[PDB]
Write a protein that binds this ligand. Structure first.
Ligand code: SF4
Ligand code: SF4
Ligand code: SF4
Lengths: 173, 176, 97, 82, 106, 70, 260, 156, 309
């Protein structure tokens, strides 16, 4: 279980290939839910509990659920799987093969370099030895948004409100 | 002579408006209804324990048709066939011939209970109290053919239920 | 308090059905465990009980016999097992047993 | 006058909104007009999340407490009373 | 490993029950209902999508409102309070815009 | 009457009672007859890891007191 | 034809229970035709018989005996309770409120016993026959009717306690299916439909039949024409029916039960 | 034998489950539906026996034909019946459902629902009293209790 | 031993759901002057077993699923998420103690929504999709108000840790401090589980086993939500030496809340989609926002900011 993070990252890539093959929307949405869940697992493994639950509650919970909502109401497609017609099947298989080639060139060869330099050592090495005491670094920093990042709060809130306005103006016909 | 349902103006007294808003916000009437159902919970249930307990019934109850006999043992039916005529569903089929003795005894008294409406006109028409709807309501069958009752079936039903049928007639003949 | 009286009455009902065995027997054969005066028993074996205290509809009840006309009725309590003479009293057509 | 009637009409017709505006409004005005807000700030600062890194005594720091527990230094007695 | 074990056990239990409910009960022979799904041939009303996009945006604003419990421990209580009230006021303003204008049609 | 519902509610109550009791008992049984320690922050875990080393049997439940010193 | 969630054209297709009763009546005698009317409205049985009985009596140029007329009205109002219970409870049941249905249906079971005590059948009675009623009331029937009516008012109030003031019930009934008074008359609406819109019309008052002229009651009148007002009207009709029932139980005259 | 004993006991268990938790669908067509409601009314309370009125015909086990099956309604009855899952039992309530009753000679009345769908229990009456309908259901329960589907499969 | 704990959390909940079916039947009946299941076993104690056995023997009909794959995943997701939501709950000691257990619960409920969408879409049934989308709309509105209420009440808890709620409510139940939020929270929980009056009567294509599992998942969610309400507002005394006391009190509270769920089910007429959303958008949401403002300002203005740790 020392390479659990690497396994999760590979599964993340696999799910990305799955939904990036542009399959039937329903099957793709799943290809994204699976990858999203994996990514949350990776973030939790690095210690980002709040951010891990963030994607699960917002991205997977709401963003992808509204995406599915649309696919369900505007359903004009013939259902097909990732291993369906060659257009999707070949793309999925080729993506998996490219990922597997990267993995082999990464583990068997320690210093793998395609566009960036990568080291085959387990990601556990990058973890830093330190103690936060009675602290949640992630939580404390994110809560500092209300104290330090007042400007960020203002801009993000204005963007949200104007987003509601824009959505209504667009979907008024 | 006529009553105005609804048609009640709401008072705009600040106290009245306050109580109305209290009803809206604090959900008072919903709580009242909830309490009513809770009261119904602690009442005594009205379910009878069938078939160990049977529901109330009156002596005038109309059920399974039955052919009766005189105390001597002779079939009361004298083949007048007026019960066949009165039957609003044309369910009774009566064919009669002079018996060996010479009396008007039916050779066929067939009533398909699957067509009878259990109106009771037959028992009201019979001039000798021969065909009388019995007290048995639980005579469900598994095949359609069984519902069609022969004369023999009617005679057997009469012989089986005679005690109750006679008691009920004795308890109701004065009203009729 | 009256709660103790209720529990005691339950135990009395347990005793009145002839011990725990009979109490369970009436519980699992009739789904009712109240007791009443044995008005009478037909020849087939069905026993008829009446309790005026119970509300109309449950004042009179019949415990069906185990064996009737060469048929096991320990669990198969047919509604037509009631004899004609008892039918009047059980169905409240008359008030005379 | 006219505003007073409007409030009565609003509570008569849409009491939920009237309550929402009132609760929200108080949740803004009341904080500024409250003395315990100052205390709430002090309590947050008082809580010693991290170690109080000692300073090297130079001989010219009378106020700074060079001891475990003596009069020099901040006091949490105010909180104890609260 | 404990939480991973819980997830694995729950998922496997559910999948096993789905197996014993989808393939085991259909083993029993029940003749054959030679009954075709007679089909012989779109309500994409905005009434539904609007409920969805508005929910997405309100959920986004709720996401910004999540770190509030830890944000109450900040020394700059006034600033944090002002920002929190600002975010809540913006949520209320978005709701009011939709309510006042042609929105909340659901 | 209404007390006839009580049997089913009691059975459900026992069913729901099983989990909490099981969790508490298993926690105490696997944590040296003590409430299972919590690590919500790194400091708490650091104490556990130190305690594990101090015990010498790689178990944090066993705690060494003044008898262990000197 | 639904615009997604809005009703544009609701075409009612009927005839799923067309049994050709009218033609069958022509092939049977007047007495034999009476049971058919019981089936027509299987919720209000004896009321159907009364209408047929009055029509035959009018053609026969005969008058039912005074006792029978009071008996007809007494059971007629009992029949009105049966339907109003059925109408309100089943309407609430379809809306979602299921508890009131069972509460009032036990009272409906009690009233069915009154039918069976006087005719021998629970629903279809054929008791009101052209010329009067089939038989006289069984000794003790009137006393039990008084007992039921005495405790029936509480039951109606319990129904109101659970529905009338309930906001969800009002939202599902208030300002729903509003019918203008003029439309109701032109569309041939009758009964609660007319009264719901405020039209002060009731045959028991305007065109008295049997001994309804000898009873005193009040006609509930709606104000808005929505379902809620008609719901209130039907409830109030149940209350006023008890008023008529009490009068009949105290004015039942001695005499025969069929025209002599 | 032991095999017969095991199969018989298992068959009894299966029979008990179905007869105890029969789920009927209310195909209320006419007057008989009213008495069916009185069966589910507090006095008789079919639910006490485990017979709960299942609105969904796709999750029902007993179709209680209550009323006059007209020619116009006849196709619907059969189509609903074949969309019921198995085991499915049909209980005919009322003379109209049994053999047309008052409308046997009508021009637009099916001469009994037996023609359209196979019937298992016929409840006589017009309308059959709620106890009689309850009696029919209990008779159907006893009918299910007698069924030996597994035993016949083993002895085949 | 940990696996034993997982089993002792999963199996009892399923049995409790099975008997909750009978409890609901009997409670509704006795509120309707009827006796619930009383023939099948003593006091109907064998009724759930009979129902389960009948269901797992009924011929399963195929609903022409556009994607069996998906049609089968929906039940699995629902049941697994329902089982998982029980894990973080502190019955005094939780199985898995998470610093952010509350957010975990919310996320699990959010994923559960997909089961609805997947079921309807794969069902290949216009009416199925319409009804599924209506369910999506209903759960959409509840999540917002539920999240806001949960955040506001946890502003006095001091964190998202579920265990801390016991300590916060050690002296006084949270409801006495936040009763309006409690009202809206309970109604929102009703809306979440589609329990009446937020049902949409008239995933039905599911046959027998599948349906049975969906039913079990829904009722387990009912029990879990009532437990969450109990822990949030109806705090219970916990003696560290004897946790059984807290377990008993908590179980009793959860049972009371489920009984209230049934009591409401047979007390009120069902809402209408427009009415349900004009509640969860135009009555609850503004009040939730105002109360969130109040529950942010109150701890600061009263110097009652709860401890972070
Ligand atoms: S009316 Fe009576 S006597 Fe005449 S045929 Fe019928 S049963 Fe016989
Ligand atoms: S009771 Fe009516 S339906 Fe039955 S045989 Fe007599 S007349 Fe015919
Ligand atoms: S049998 Fe009688 S009560 Fe039943 S539907 Fe036919 S006419 Fe109506």
């Amino acid at each position: 279980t020392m390479y659990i993070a690497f396994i999760l990252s590979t599964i993340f890539v696999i799910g990305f290939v799955g939904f990036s093959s542009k399959p039937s929307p329903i099957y793709g949405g799943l290809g994204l839910i699976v990858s999203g869940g994996v990514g949350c697992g990776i973030v939790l493994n690095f210690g980002g509990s709040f951010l891990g639950l963030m994607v699960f509650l917002i991205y997977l919970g709401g963003m992808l659920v509204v995406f599915g909502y649309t696919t369900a109401m505007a359903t004009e497609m013939y259902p097909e799987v990732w291993v369906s017609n060659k257009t999707v099947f070949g793309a999925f298989v080729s993506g998996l093969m490219m990922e597997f080639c990267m993995v082999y060139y990464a583990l068997k060869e320690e210093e793998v370099e395609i566009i960036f330099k990568f080291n085959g050592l387990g990601d556990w090495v990058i973890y830093d030895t330190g103690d936060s005491g009675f602290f949640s670094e992630e939580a404390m920093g994110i809560a500092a948004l209300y104290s330090y990042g007042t400007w960020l709060v203002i801009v993000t809130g204005w963007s949200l409100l104007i987003g509601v306005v824009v959505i209504m103006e667009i979907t008024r016909g | 002579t006529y009553k105005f349902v609804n048609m009640r103006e709401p008072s705009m007294d600040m106290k009245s408006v306050t109580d109305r808003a209290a009803q809206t916000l604090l959900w008072t009437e919903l709580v009242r209804g909830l309490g009513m159902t809770l009261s119904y919970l602690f009442r005594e249930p009205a379910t009878i324990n069938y078939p160990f307990e049977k529901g109330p019934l009156s002596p005038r109850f109309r059920g399974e048709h039955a052919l009766r006999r005189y105390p001597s043992g002779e079939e009361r039916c004298i083949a007048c066939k007026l019960c066949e005529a009165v039957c609003p569903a044309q369910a009774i089929t009566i064919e009669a011939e002079p018996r060996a003795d010479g009396s008007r005894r039916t050779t066929r008294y067939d009533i398909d209970m699957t067509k009878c409406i259990y109106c009771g006109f037959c028992q009201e028409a019979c001039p000798v109290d021969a065909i009388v709807e019995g007290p048995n309501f639980e005579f469900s069958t598994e095949t359609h053919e069984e519902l069609l009752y022969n004369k023999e079936k009617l005679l057997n039903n009469g012989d089986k239920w005679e005690a109750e049928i006679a008691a009920n007639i004795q308890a109701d003949y004065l009203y009729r | 308090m009256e709660l103790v009286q209720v529990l005691r009455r339950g135990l009395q009902q347990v005793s009145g059905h002839g011990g725990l065995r009979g109490y369970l027997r009436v519980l699992f054969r009739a789904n009712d465990v109240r007791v009443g005066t044995l008005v009478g028993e037909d020849k087939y074996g069905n026993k008829y009980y009446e309790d005026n205290k119970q509300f109309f509809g449950r004042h009179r009840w019949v415990i069906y016999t185990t064996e009737m006309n060469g048929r096991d009725t320990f669990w198969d309590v047919d509604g037509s097992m009631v004899p004609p003479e008892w039918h009047r009293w059980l169905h409240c057509m008359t008030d005379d047993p | 006058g006219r505003i007073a009637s409007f409030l009565k009409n609003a509570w008569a017709k849409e009491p939920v909104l009237v309550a929402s505006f009132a609760i929200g409004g108080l949740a803004i005005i009341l904080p500024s007009l409250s003395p315990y807000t100052n205390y709430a700030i002090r309590i947050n600062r008082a809580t010693p999340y991290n170690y109080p890194v000692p300073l090297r005594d130079d001989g010219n720091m009378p106020d700074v407490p060079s001891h475990p527990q003596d009069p020099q230094g901040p006091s949490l007695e105010w909180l104890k009373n609260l | 490993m404990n939480i991973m074990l819980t997830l694995l056990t729950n998922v496997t239990l559910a999948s096993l029950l789905v197996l014993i409910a989808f393939w085991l009960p259909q083993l029993n022979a029940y003749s054959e209902k030679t009954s075709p799904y007679e089909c012989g041939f779109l309500p994409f009303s905005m009434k539904f999508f609007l409920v969805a996009i508005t929910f997405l945006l309100f959920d986004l604003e709720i996401a910004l409102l999540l770190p509030l419990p830890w944000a109450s421990q900040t020394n700059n209580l006034k600033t944090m309070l002002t920002m929190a009230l600002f975010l809540l006021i913006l949520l209320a303003a978005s709701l009011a815009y939709e309510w006042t204008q042609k929105g909340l049609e659901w | 009457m209404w007390f006839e519902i009580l049997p089913g509610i009691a059975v459900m109550a026992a069913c729901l009672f099983i989990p909490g009791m099981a969790t508490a008992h298993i926690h105490k049984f696997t944590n040296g007859g003590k409430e299972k320690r919590v690590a919500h922050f790194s400091y708490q875990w650091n104490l556990m890891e130190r305690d594990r080393c101090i015990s010498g049997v790689n178990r944090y439940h066993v705690t060494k007191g003044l008898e262990n010193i000197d | 034809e639904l615009s997604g969630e809005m009703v544009r054209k609701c075409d009612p297709h009927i005839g799923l229970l067309h049994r050709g009763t009218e033609k069958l009546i022509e092939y049977k005698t007047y007495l034999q035709a009476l049971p058919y009317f019981d089936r027509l409205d299987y919720v209000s049985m004896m009321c159907n018989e009364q209408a047929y009985s009055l029509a035959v009596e009018k053609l026969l140029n005969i008058q039912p005996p005074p006792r029978a007329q009071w008996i007809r009205v007494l059971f007629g109002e009992i029949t009105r309770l049966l339907n109003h219970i059925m109408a309100v409870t089943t309407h609430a049941l379809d809306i979602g409120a299921m508890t009131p249905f069972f509460w009032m249906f036990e009272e409906r079971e009690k009233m069915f016993e009154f039918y069976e005590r006087v005719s021998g059948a629970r629903m279809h009675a054929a008791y009101i026959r052209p010329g009067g009623v089939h038989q006289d009331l069984p000794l003790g029937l009137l006393d039990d009717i008084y007992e039921f009516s005495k405790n029936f008012s509480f039951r109606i109030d319990e129904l109101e306690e659970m529905l009338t003031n309930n906001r969800i019930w009002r939202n599902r009934t208030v300002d729903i299916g509003v019918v203008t008074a003029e439309d109701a008359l032109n569309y041939g609406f009758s009964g609660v439909m007319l009264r719901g819109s405020g039209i002060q019309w009731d045959l028991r008052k305007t065109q008295p039949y049997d001994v309804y002229d000898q009873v005193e009651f009040d006609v509930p009148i709606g104000s808005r024409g929505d379902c809620y007002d008609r719901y209130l009207c039907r409830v109030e009709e149940m209350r006023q029916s008890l008023r008529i029932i009490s009068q009949c139980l105290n004015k039942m005259p001695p005499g025969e039960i069929k025209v002599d | 034998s032991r095999g017969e004993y095991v199969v018989a006991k298992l068959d009894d268990l299966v029979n008990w489950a179905r007869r105890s938790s029969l789920w009927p669908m209310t195909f209320g067509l006419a007057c008989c539906a009213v008495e069916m409601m009185h069966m589910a009314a507090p006095r008789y309370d079919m639910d006490r026996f485990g017979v709960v009125f299942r609105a969904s015909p796709r999750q029902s086990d007993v179709m209680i034909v209550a009323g006059t099956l007209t020619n116009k309604m006849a196709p619907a009855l059969r189509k609903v019946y074949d969309q019921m899952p198995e085991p499915r039992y049909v209980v005919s309530m009322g003379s109209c459902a049994n053999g047309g009753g008052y409308y046997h000679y009508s021009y637009s009345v099916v001469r009994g629902c037996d023609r359209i769908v196979p019937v298992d229990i016929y409840v006589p009456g017009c309308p059959p009293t709620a106890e009689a309908l309850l009696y029919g259901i209990l008779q159907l329960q006893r009918k299910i209790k007698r069924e030996k589907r597994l035993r016949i499969w083993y002895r085949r | 031993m940990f696996m034993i704990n997982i089993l002792s959390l999963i199996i009892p909940i399923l049995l409790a759901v099975a008997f909750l079916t009978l409890v609901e039947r009997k409670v509704l009946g006795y509120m309707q002057l009827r006796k619930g299941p009383n023939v099948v076993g003593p006091y109907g104690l064998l009724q759930p077993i009979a129902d389960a056995l009948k269901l797992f023997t009924k011929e399963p009909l195929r609903p022409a699923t556009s994607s069996i794959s998906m049609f089968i995943i929906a039940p699995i997701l629902a049941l697994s998420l329902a089982l998982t939501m029980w894990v973080p709950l502190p019955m005094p000691y939780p199985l898995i103690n998470m610093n952010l257990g509350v957010l975990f619960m919310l996320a699990m409920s959010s994923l559960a929504v997909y089961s609805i969408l997947w079921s309807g879409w794969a069902s290949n049934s216009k009416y199925a999709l319409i009804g599924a989308l209506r369910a999506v709309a209903q759960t959409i509105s509840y999540e917002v108000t539920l999240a806001i209420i949960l955040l506001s009440v946890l502003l006095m808890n001091g964190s998202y840790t579920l265990s801390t709620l016991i300590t916060t409510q050690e002296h006084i139940w949270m409801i006495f401090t936040s009763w309006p939020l409690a009202m809206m929270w309970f109604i929102s929980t009703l809306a979440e589980t589609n329990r009446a009056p937020f049902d949409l009567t008239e995933n039905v294509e599911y046959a027998a086993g599948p349906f049975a599992m969906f039913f079990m998942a829904e009722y387990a969610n009912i029990i879990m939500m009532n437990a969450f309400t109990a822990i949030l507002f109806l705090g219970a005394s916990h003696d560290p030496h004897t946790p059984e006391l807290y377990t008993i009190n908590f179980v009793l509270k959860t049972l009371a809340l489920t009984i209230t769920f049934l009591w409401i089910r047979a007390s009120y007429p069902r809402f209408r989609y427009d009415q349900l959303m004009h509640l969860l958008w135009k009555s609850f949401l503004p009040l939730t926002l105002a109360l969130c403002m109040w529950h942010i300002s109150l701890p600061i203005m009263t110097a009652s900011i709860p401890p972070q740790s």
